[PDB]
Amino acid sequence: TTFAARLNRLFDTVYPPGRGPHTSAEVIAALKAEGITMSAPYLSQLRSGNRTNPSGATMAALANFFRIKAAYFTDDEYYEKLDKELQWLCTMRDDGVRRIAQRAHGLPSAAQQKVLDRIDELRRAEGI
């Protein structure tokens, strides 16, 4: 996956409660406050793929804004490991998965093991 896709993936998956995805402007602004200068056109270009190969410092500033290791942009193994965590940040906001998953919070370790067992049974009764 490209820089643009990884960058945009952070924009789409990493953000605060009570609101939605960060905007490019919020990022330019936050960088400004740490005394870092980045142009909106440049950020835009990085997001769109009209410029590529961002410098180590540009990458470290974007990674610091989202609060993740820069290795996310440059290392494939780590990218995938962390992308799994981001994936969950999506599936968790699902309403269908909230229903089930949620009520299980509150059961003791032992009782959750029986839920896992019931699930395995429903799996076989289907595929799977």
Next chain:
Amino acid sequence: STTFAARLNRLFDTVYPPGRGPHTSAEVIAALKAEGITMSAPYLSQLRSGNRTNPSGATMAALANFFRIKAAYFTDDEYYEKLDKELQWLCTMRDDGVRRIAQRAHGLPSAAQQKVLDRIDELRRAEGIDA
């Protein structure tokens, strides 16, 4: 109704980045420093322990801003309600156990998933969690 220490500690406990754990007090001190905002490390420890209370407006702004939430969370008691529900979903959905269950139940048809939920409800009544 919740004190200021409880609302702050909740933020530490539930709001942190993917692929790691809760932020530490020092991380917050560090960050504000990078923004040009000065805050005392032992002071912060006392807001958290409730030794000191009634924070200044500017103090609540700096902290809210770090966690990237509206300051109204500490003041406007109705917004605190709205948000603490979302925080509750965060704590809930990032818990390993619930996650192991949701990812295993994922892919089952709608009718089978209603069944997983029925078994959860049964154990909750049986463990005394519901009554």
